[PDB]
Write a protein that binds this ligand. Structure first.
Ligand SMILES: CCCCCCCCCCCCCCCCCC(=O)OC[C@H](COP(=O)([O-])OCC(O)COP(=O)([O-])OC[C@@H](COC(=O)CCCCCCCCCCCCCCCCC)OC(=O)CCCCCCCCCCCCCCCCC)OC(=O)CCCCCCCCCCCCCCCCC
Ligand SMILES: CCCCCCCCCCCCCCCCCC(=O)OC[C@H](COP(=O)([O-])OCC(O)COP(=O)([O-])OC[C@@H](COC(=O)CCCCCCCCCCCCCCCCC)OC(=O)CCCCCCCCCCCCCCCCC)OC(=O)CCCCCCCCCCCCCCCCC
Ligand SMILES: CCCCCCCCCCCCCCCCC[C@@H](O)O[C@H](CO[C@H](O)CCCCCCCCCCCCCCC)COP(=O)(O)OCC[N+](C)(C)C
Ligand SMILES: CCCCCCCCCCCCCCCCC[C@@H](O)O[C@H](CO[C@H](O)CCCCCCCCCCCCCCC)COP(=O)(O)OCC[N+](C)(C)C
Ligand SMILES: CCCCCCCC/C=C\CCCCCCCC(=O)OC[C@H](COP(=O)(O)OCCN)OC(=O)CCCCCCC/C=C\CCCCCCCC
Ligand SMILES: CCCCCCCC/C=C\CCCCCCCC(=O)OC[C@H](COP(=O)(O)OCCN)OC(=O)CCCCCCC/C=C\CCCCCCCC
Ligand SMILES: CCCCCCCC/C=C\CCCCCCCC(=O)O[C@H](COC(=O)CCCCCCC/C=C/CCCCCCCC)COP(=O)(O)OCCN
Ligand SMILES: CCCCCCCCCCCC(=O)SCCNC(=O)CCNC(=O)[C@H](O)C(C)(C)COP(=O)(O)O
Lengths: 459, 52, 178, 64, 103, 603, 88
């Protein structure tokens, strides 16, 4: 695994020893090459895992997340090139350093054979994101947003640490392989109930769970474009990955303890999809859509059936790509209009036709149009839920209908109708933005050809 | 270019601040009517007719 | 559409608007032209019998019973001209309307085609640049103190002046740009 | 006499059936005149800023 | 009623400006200055590039790759009627029970 | 080597080549629409071969060519079903689409984006063929959603028009309501039969339960605009007339019916679902014919006619006669597509005028449209030995000779009469009287594109019923003996419809005016269903979406509970802790207190 | 479409045609600049009828606010030309 970690570390001295006007080119080229190298982790086994060493191991759940993490950095650099133009070389190098450190921590987090090492890196990712949000955000609310994004996380994560060390004091190890092979049932006890809660709540808060989702709209709205991209694409999936790893020690207590979270997610997906219908801000609408999709992923993980896990993996990958694309489109509009109010700039199809095509395809993938991987994950989760209980179909279908409604509402409001007359600074789309949009969308339509790459270890 | 005094505020109680709120929203004092002072966060915002 | 609206509609304007609406809806009811002509002459006669009423209270009690009767028998599916706000081709060609400023973003290779058009466009832009400075002063001196009372604009007064705020009325895209 | 139209939340009263328009007063007329004055002042400010050739951006809207 | 004199004058001036703009929207005889630069017959070539080549590719793919695997193409087991004979075996299906034919 | 599979796949494959060339140079020229039309015609003349092979032998295939992902014991593969329904419907759809494209070459000549329009039409055709030939539920869902997205794009063709966007979103909403049942059925079939393939579904379901069939019926009701989910089809007339003629007239809207035809082995083993389908079809056909007989927009009248015919199709399905419903689909394609041909010709000649109150004497002013529309109306109402006869007459006979609802039978007969009524309404108000259009006459039919495209479907609407009925093998036992009056019931009710509607139309010439009745108002505003159901639910949803979810819970109470409470408590505790005046007297008094307390409590 | 690009001459001729077919006006005294209220002695009801005739003959609707201040055939022609963007 060092053949990916070491180049990502070398990205830092290369960035800091670069010319003042070569940082973006060098960073983009070498991050793309690192993505290409990481692409060879996809050759997974039907047996246990790719156990590289005592410290790092790869799995067909970890490999798609690793590849998406490596692929996201070049897109983040391309998106950040525009709004950082008027800023000094040292500060741009610091921004690229924060992005590189975030990638390094995420890469080490997804392999992380140890649960304490996983926790340490899973919490180390917090610092670069907070600095990016509270340093290079625009509005005055960013500081407040950062505070939320901080404390919520720690409010969930501090009990987990205690639980973790407690387990190693009883089991003797926190290695995931030993934990899986030596797993034992949890008796229905108050102590075991609180151990279950301490294990679950940390990952629940970062999905986020419906009741615990307040930090996400603030953090995603006030963050710069690279921050929003990394928050929606990779950082939300840490909770799902952690739950998928940790639910192996929580059986059979998950059967009883899953009910409040299942109800919260099943009702909150409807609530947040309905919230999307009445939203005056593009970024907030995209954030609430992310909350709905992650609610579906929470349901899938809580059901803990093979089809549930496959659907959850597919949906995590598809949502990451789609939400990053949607945020990039919103930012392309914002850098022209500087308002971030959906109703202000209207009828952009007549002025930006190719960008309108990008908007249409992004809305189509968000709408879960078959045979996209978005719908593959959606349908697998829905079928698993139907087997779990036939009444889930009402909530699932209502969520599908509202999702289509708000996706097409977002498309029609911004692209169709009549152009706003007083806005005359809508310049033609740059090659950088179109390239960014294509680099988001072609991986999705190309992954629909080989779904088993993103269906997880239970395929 | 909007200042702090041009943003929505709390529910107006006295006719003087009622007139100030009406002047803020570019409409007549006789026509200005805020939402009823309930627990909802309507605050100082005109209750225009519900016509589409 | 073009004309600025007033503060209110006078009684005569209300009566004339009711006359036009009732005639159009009767045409919707009376499909054939001879039947429509007969009933429209009857309708005009029924308007004319109270043309000379001097009592304003009487005339206002009238037109009210009349509009109530209209709302009762108003043909819930009246004929609409296709381009009218309720027609089947109302805003059909708005997607083809492109603003004129977009031409400023054209590539030089695009402007290499159509050189005469862009030369005339440059002339128009220069005319706008000078006329605007004249227009601001003329509007400032002609507006009454305390702000305008009606959104009606004055014409040009001198020889070389242009009507104030003319650019976006003169440079409309077209009724059917494509 | 004809059957009466009963307005509702989603089917409102027509303008031509509104008793308030038939009850005119000098105070009503001055209210209409000053409403038109506010609208005209706002329209004048918007068009003055809209037709300006030097302006190269979004016209800021405090109401929005 | 009717237009006020100022309304007439403003409409007339705006009308003249609008008509001059509309006239200026026209194209000169050379206006599309195109930059030139390069680096049964129609039906016969169309039926080759759009019918013959796709059917060749699809027939090759079906006959040599799809049919290679079992159960990929499954047919109907054509209907057998009395009096028919079979190519593979050669035996003749016996006739029916000579029902009474009348009307 | 047995060209059936190769040719039936080559059809669908060559349908996709112009989409590949959509980035080439020809897409930037004016020859692209003719290229697409020629490709579609070649596809039709090539698909005529499997039709002949089936008609000769009855040849059937499943072609599972590409193996896509496998899910433990479930295998998903790209599989095509090439049964009677597919090989019969494909040539009909290709013929209709060929006529539509030739017509569009004239109707949409002034549209700046005509290449795009043609491209959109081809994409819809491709998705429809994917829907029709699918062997498993995932592929058929792909086609199901593809035709819906193409419909959304083509309805909102003029995206500067607010009403077009509203209608497109309406269609999406209703089709998602149907999609709920589609997904329910798919999940049930996977959970219980362990398959989405049709063969395993038929093998393992000898007595199909209620949930999968109810989901299928809900999907069919959504996509074929049945009574609960009907208004989107009349609302869809916002798109260009070729779009209305191809998608929302003859090809896309039958898809729901097609689905119930595709699952007919399971429908015949369930008795309650058949009754539900029959009642839904009966109420749909009655209500839509009732709405049609009073409309003034010609496209609206033809759309309501399409809805009534779809309701009749699902009545046929509900009486357990699926092959008859398929035959009706095939005939209705021809004559309803030609009916929109004539409507679009009239609209174009009269300067985009769609109201029949302004269409006067066109019987002589434009004669080819007149004769084509007369022939189409005769085929629609049911005229002996025309194309619509061989389906509709058998539909009526089967409904009369079955153990069914009395009310459903009555409503089917009334719907037939009202079909005759709205046909004569169109003819009378559009062709017979004196002209009522503006004085400057621009009427012109003399364009070979329009004439040829209309006349191909005209020959279809005359002879296709006879040819197809005499060429397909018999798939049901017929009704050989009937009461003399009960054999004539269709003709009797149709002639009564003509006579009564014509007599009521002739009274419009009388110099007499009266105000409308309650029944007229109910019929004109579509039973008031679009008003109430597009104002009460939507508002009551959207309002809640801002009042409770967005503000009361998300912005107020969820903030009040976790973060605001914590901030308030920590604030107060910090204020209490850090507020000491700096007087060491109080400090050492507390020291004495703590010291005294410490000694006593511990020991 | 195939609609001819109508000119000012056609609009003027068609307006005068419709007006001469109104029998409350004698055609020989009619002129392009003749006022409706005073030069021809017509009531405002006649003026709105004339506007309706123009609408029905040109196939589009003139709004009440614009229609109620059209008092000469010449300015009716000018309004139609401005709405339809006629060059000459
Ligand atoms: C259908 C068969 C197609 C075969 C031909 C091959 C086509 C390859 C396309 C690959 C993907 C396209 C790339 C996306 C970005 C588009 C690039 C662009 O800007 O165009 C510039 C170019 C130049 O135009 P321009 O004038 O310069 O620009 C003017 C404006 O942009 C205005 O431009 P516009 O108005 O023309 O719009 C652009 C166009 C293009 O933009 C798009 O919207 C394309 C993306 C749509 C998908 C949305 C996500 C949903 C998930 C679907 C995943 C399918 C992928 C399969 C694997 C792909 C491998 C990468 O959008 C549309 O026209 C709407 C089409 C809606 C289609 C919905 C149906 C989806 C399911 C269909 C069946 C798929 C499974 C079949 C299974 C059974 C059969 C085997 O235009 C084009 O070339 C058009 C692109 C081709 C149309 C795509 C429609 C169907 C293709 C589906 C994907 C491949 C199917 C594989 C099956 C083959 C058998
Ligand atoms: C008894 C069968 C005769 C059906 C009723 C026809 C009738 O008298 O309607 C006029 C009459 C009043 O018409 P209106 O209010 O003066 O309409 C104003 C103008 O006529 C405005 O006229 P419009 O040009 O705008 O639209 C004309 C349309 C507008 O008229 C309507 O409002 C139609 C509403 C009721 C007719 C639907 C019947 C189901 O009427 C029609 O198109 C003809 C009506 C359909 C008659 C042909 C087929 C119906 C016979 C089916 C049952 C008997 C055969 C049994 C076979 C087994 O309707 C009624 O009194 C309702 C009678 C039944 C209600 C239950
Ligand atoms: C502009 C108009 C169109 C012009 C172009 C016309 C041509 C269109 C043709 C292309 C699309 C049509 C679909 C037809 C697909 C043909 C190729 C396909 O069959 O091959 C696939 C093969 O492709 C791969 O399966 C999918 C590609 C994997 C995508 C990886 C993403 C690239 C990395 C980018 C960064 C990652 C970002 C996202 C993080 C998760 C599936 O093959 P498969 O049967 O299975 O086995 C392969 C062969 N074997 C048998 C020897 C093993
Ligand atoms: C706010 C946004 C979302 C945040 C996250 C929300 C999710 C947290 C929900 C916690 C999951 C369940 C907690 C406890 C489940 C135990 C089962 C219980 O509910 O059922 C009965 C439990 O009985 C009563 O509940 C006893 C406890 C009563 C006191 C609980 C307080 C009630 C409301 C508190 C909710 C506040 C949550 C937030 C706290 C800050 C059965 O009684 P019994 O069969 O005999 O004993 C079963 C347990 N044994 C077997 C181990 C002995
Ligand atoms: C083009 C011009 C070049 C002509 C020369 C090639 C002639 C054909 C020879 C091709 C060689 C045979 C071949 O393709 O190999 C089989 C190979 C499949 O790979 P296998 O490993 O054998 O099995 C699949 C699972 N592993 O077949 C192919 O890939 C070619 C044709 C594939 C089918 C067409 C796919 C089109 C649709 C794209 C996918 C759409 C999304 C999925 C829909 C899901 C529906 C349930
Ligand atoms: C028992 C002790 C438990 C300690 C738990 C600490 C949780 C962390 C949050 C502590 C907040 C304390 C600070 C505070 O509330 O002051 C009010 C402060 C005043 O603003 P100032 O920044 O001080 O001034 C700037 C303008 N002049 O208000 C704020 O700014 C609040 C902004 C941050 C809000 C973050 C909320 C995070 C909590 C989410 C829920 C979970 C809470 C943690 C406990 C979980 C439950 C077991
Ligand atoms: C987003 C903000 C959420 C804040 C945190 C939410 C998670 C809360 C989970 C509990 C926190 C601490 C749990 C302890 C960690 C696990 C250790 C463990 O399981 O050991 C138990 C110990 O169990 C405990 O001590 C639990 C005591 C909990 C005290 C703190 C209560 C916090 C609030 C309680 C109400 C809310 C609970 C769920 C809240 C969910 C989040 C909203 C048994 O060990 P022994 O006692 O040694 O062996 C038995 C024989 N003697
Ligand atoms: C079929 C649809 C339903 C139809 C039902 C509607 C029933 C309407 C009939 C009601 C009768 C009336 O006129 S309602 C009576 C309203 N009051 C008056 O008529 C008083 C003075 N008249 C005017 O001022 C007019 O404008 C006039 C002088 C004519 C022209 O003026 P010009 O000189 O400035 O053109």
């Amino acid at each position: 695994m060092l053949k990916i970690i070491i180049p990502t570390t070398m990205l830092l001295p290369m960035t800091w020893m670069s010319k003042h006007n070569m940082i973006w080119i060098n960073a983009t080229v070498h991050s793309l090459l690192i993505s290409l190298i990481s692409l060879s982790l996809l050759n997974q086994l039907g047996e246990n895992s790719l156990n590289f060493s005592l410290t790092f191991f790869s799995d067909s759940l970890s490999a798609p997340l690793l590849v998406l993490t490596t692929w996201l950095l070049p897109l983040m650099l391309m998106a950040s090139q525009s709004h950082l133009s008027k800023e000094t070389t040292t500060r741009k190098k610091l921004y690229i350093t924060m992005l590189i450190l975030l990638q390094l921590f995420l890469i080490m987090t997804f392999t992380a054979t140890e649960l304490i090492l996983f926790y340490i890196l899973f919490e180390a990712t917090l610092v670069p994101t907070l600095i990016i949000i509270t340093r290079w955000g625009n509005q005055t609310e960013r500081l407040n947003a950062g505070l939320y994004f901080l404390f919520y996380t720690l409010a969930g994560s501090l009990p987990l640490l205690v639980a973790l060390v407690y387990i190693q004091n009883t089991t003797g190890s926190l290695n995931f392989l030993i934990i899986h092979y030596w797993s034992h049932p949890l008796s229905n006890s108050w102590s075991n109930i609180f151990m279950w809660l301490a294990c679950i709540m940390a990952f629940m808060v970062k999905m986020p769970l419906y009741g615990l989702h307040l930090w996400l709209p603030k953090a995603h709205v006030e963050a710069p474009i690279a921050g929003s991209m990394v928050l929606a694409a990779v950082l939300l999936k840490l909770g799902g990955y952690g739950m998928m790893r940790i639910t192996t020690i929580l059986n059979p207590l998950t059967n009883y303890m899953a009910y409040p979270f299942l109800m919260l997610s099943m009702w909150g997906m409807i609530m947040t999809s309905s919230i999307c219908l009445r939203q005056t801000d593009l970024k907030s609408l995209i954030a609430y859509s992310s909350v709905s999709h992650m609610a579906l992923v929470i349901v899938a993980i809580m059901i803990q059936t093979p089809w549930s896990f496959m659907g959850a993996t597919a949906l995590m990958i598809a949502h990451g790509l789609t939400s990053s694309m949607l945020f990039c489109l919103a930012n392309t509009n914002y850098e022209r209009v500087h308002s971030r109010t959906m109703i202000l700039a209207r009828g952009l199809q007549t002025l930006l036709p190719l960008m309108a095509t990008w908007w249409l395809v992004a809305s189509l993938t968000n709408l879960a149009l078959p045979p996209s991987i978005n719908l593959i994950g959606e349908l697998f989760i829905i079928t698993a839920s139907f087997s779990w209980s036939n009444i889930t179909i009402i909530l699932m279908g209502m969520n599908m209908m509202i999702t289509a409604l708000y996706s097409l509402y977002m498309l029609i409001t911004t692209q169709r109708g009549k152009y706003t007359h007083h806005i005359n600074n809508i310049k033609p789309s740059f090659t950088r933005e179109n390239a960014l949009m294509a680099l988001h969308i072609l991986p999705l339509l190309l992954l629909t050809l080989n779904p088993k790459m993103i269906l997880g270890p239970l395929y | 270019h909007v200042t702090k005094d041009m943003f929505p505020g709390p529910y107006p109680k006295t006719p003087e601040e009622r007139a100030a709120a009406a002047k803020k929203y570019n409409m007549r004092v006789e026509d200005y009517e805020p939402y009823p002072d309930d627990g909802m966060g309507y605050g100082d915002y005109p209750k225009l007719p519900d016509r589409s | 559409a073009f004309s600025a609206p007033a503060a209110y509609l006078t009684h005569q304007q209300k009566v004339l608007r009711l006359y036009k609406r009732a005639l159009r809806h009767l045409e919707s009811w009376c499909v054939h032209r001879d039947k429509y002509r007969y009933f429209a002459c009857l309708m005009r006669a029924r308007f004319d019998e109270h043309k000379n009423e001097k009592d304003m209270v009487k005339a206002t009690q009238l037109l009210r019973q009349a509009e109530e009767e209209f709302w009762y028998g108003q043909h819930p599916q009246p004929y609409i001209f296709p381009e009218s706000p309720g027609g089947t081709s109302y805003e059909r060609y708005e997607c083809y309307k492109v603003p004129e400023w977009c031409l400023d973003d054209w590539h030089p290779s695009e402007k290499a085609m159509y050189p005469d058009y862009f030369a005339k466009r440059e002339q128009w832009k220069r005319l706008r640049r000078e006329s605007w400075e004249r227009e601001v002063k003329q509007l400032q001196e002609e507006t009454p103190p305390g702000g305008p009372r009606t959104e009606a604009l004055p014409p040009a007064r001198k020889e070389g002046d242009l009507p104030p705020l003319w650019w976006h009325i003169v440079t409309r895209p077209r009724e059917r740009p494509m | 006499s004809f059957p009466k139209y009963k307005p509702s939340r989603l089917a409102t009263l027509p303008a031509t059936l509104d008793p308030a328009e038939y009850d005119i007063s000098p105070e009503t007329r001055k209210a209409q005149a000053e409403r038109l004055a506010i609208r005209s002042r706002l329209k004048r400010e918007y068009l003055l800023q809209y037709n300006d050739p030097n302006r190269l951006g979004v016209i800021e809207d405090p109401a929005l | 009623s009717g237009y006020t004199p100022d309304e007439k004058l403003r409409l007339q001036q705006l009308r003249e400006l609008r008509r001059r703009w509309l006239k200026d929207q026209e194209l000169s005889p050379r206006e599309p200055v195109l930059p030139p630069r390069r680096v049964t017959y129609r039906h016969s070539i169309f039926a080759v590039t759009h019918v013959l080549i796709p059917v060749w590719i699809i027939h090759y793919y079906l006959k040599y790759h799809v049919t290679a695997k079992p159960y990929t193409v499954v047919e109907r087991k054509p209907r057998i009627f009395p009096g028919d004979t079979i190519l593979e075996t050669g035996e003749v299906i016996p006739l029916m029970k000579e029902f009474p034919d009348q009307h | 080597m047995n060209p059936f599979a190769s040719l039936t796949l080559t059809t669908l494959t060559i349908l996709t080549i112009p989409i590949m060339m959509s980035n080439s140079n020809i897409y930037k020229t004016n020859l692209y629409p003719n290229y697409v039309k020629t490709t579609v015609s070649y596809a039709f003349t090539l698909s005529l071969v499997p039709l002949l092979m089936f008609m000769h032998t009855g040849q059937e295939m499943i072609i599972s060519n590409w193996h896509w992902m496998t899910l433990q014991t479930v295998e998903l593969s790209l599989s095509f079903k090439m049964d009677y329904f597919s090989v019969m419907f494909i040539p009909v759809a290709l013929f209709v689409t060929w006529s539509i494209m030739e017509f569009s070459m004239w109707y949409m000549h002034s549209d700046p984006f005509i290449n795009r329009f043609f491209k959109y039409l081809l994409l819809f055709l491709i998705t429809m063929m994917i829907l029709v030939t699918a062997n498993n539920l995932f592929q058929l869902f792909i086609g199901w959603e593809g035709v819906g997205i193409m419909s959304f794009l083509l309805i909102g063709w003029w995206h500067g028009r607010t009403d077009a966007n509203t209608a497109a979103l309406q269609a999406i909403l209703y089709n998602r309501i149907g999609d709920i049942g589609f997904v329910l059925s798919m999940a049930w079939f996977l959970t219980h039969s362990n398959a989405w393939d049709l063969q395993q579904i038929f093998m393992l379901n000898n007595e199909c339960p209620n949930m999968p069939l109810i989901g299928l019926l809900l999907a069919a009701a959504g996509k074929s605009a049945q009574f609960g989910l009907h208004p989107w089809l009349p609302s869809a007339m916002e798109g260009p007339t070729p779009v209305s003629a191809l998608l929302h007239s003859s090809t896309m809207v039958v898809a729901g019916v097609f689905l119930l035809i595709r699952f007919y082995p399971l429908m015949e083993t369930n008795k309650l679902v058949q009754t539900m389908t029959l009642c839904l079809g009966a109420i749909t056909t009655l209500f839509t014919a009732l709405c049609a007989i009073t409309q003034n927009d010609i496209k609206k009248i033809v759309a309501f006619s399409t809805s009534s015919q779809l309701g009749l199709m699902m009545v046929t399905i509900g009486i357990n006669q699926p092959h008859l419903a398929f035959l009706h689909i095939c005939m209705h394609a021809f004559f309803k597509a030609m009916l929109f041909m004539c409507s679009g010709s009239i609209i174009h000649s009269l300067n985009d005028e769609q109201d029949i109150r302004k269409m006067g004497g066109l019987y002589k002013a434009m004669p080819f449209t007149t004769t084509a529309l007369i022939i189409g109306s005769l085929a629609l109402t049911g005229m002996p030995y025309l194309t619509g006869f061989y389906s509709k007459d058998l539909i009526i006979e089967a409904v009369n000779m079955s153990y069914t609802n009395a009310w459903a039978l009555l409503m089917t007969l009334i719907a037939t009469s009202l079909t005759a009524a709205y046909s004569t309404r169109i003819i009378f108000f559009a062709f017979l009287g004196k002209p009522r259009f503006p004085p400057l006459v621009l009427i012109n039919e003399n364009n070979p594109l329009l004439i040829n495209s209309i006349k191909r479907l005209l020959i279809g609407s005359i002879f296709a019923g006879f040819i197809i009925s005499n060429n397909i093998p018999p798939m049901t036992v017929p009704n050989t003996t009937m009461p003399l009056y009960m054999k004539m019931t269709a003709l009797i009710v149709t002639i009564m419809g003509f006579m009564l509607a014509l007599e009521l139309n002739n009274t419009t010439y009388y110099l007499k005016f009266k105000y409308p009745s309650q029944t007229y108002k109910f019929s004109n505003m579509l039973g008031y269903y679009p008003s109430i159901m597009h104002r009460l639910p939507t508002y009551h949803n959207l309002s809640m979406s801002q009042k409770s979810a967005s503000s009361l819970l998300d912005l107020i109470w969820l903030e009040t509970i976790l973060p605001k409470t914590t901030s308030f408590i920590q604030m107060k505790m910090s204020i209490m802790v850090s507020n000491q005046k700096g007087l060491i007297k109080l400090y050492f008094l507390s020291f004495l207190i703590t010291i005294m307390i410490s000694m006593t409590l511990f020991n | 479409s195939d609609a001819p690009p109508l000119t000012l001459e056609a609009i003027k001729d068609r307006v005068l045609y419709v007006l001469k077919l109104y029998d409350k006006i004698d055609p020989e005294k009619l002129s392009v600049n003749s006022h409706f209220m005073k030069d021809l002695g017509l009531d405002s009801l006649d003026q709105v009828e004339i506007i309706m005739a123009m609408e029905d003959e040109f196939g589009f609707e003139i709004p009440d606010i614009d229609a109620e201040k059209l008092m000469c055939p010449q300015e009716i022609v000018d309004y139609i030309a401005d709405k339809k963007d006629v060059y000459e």
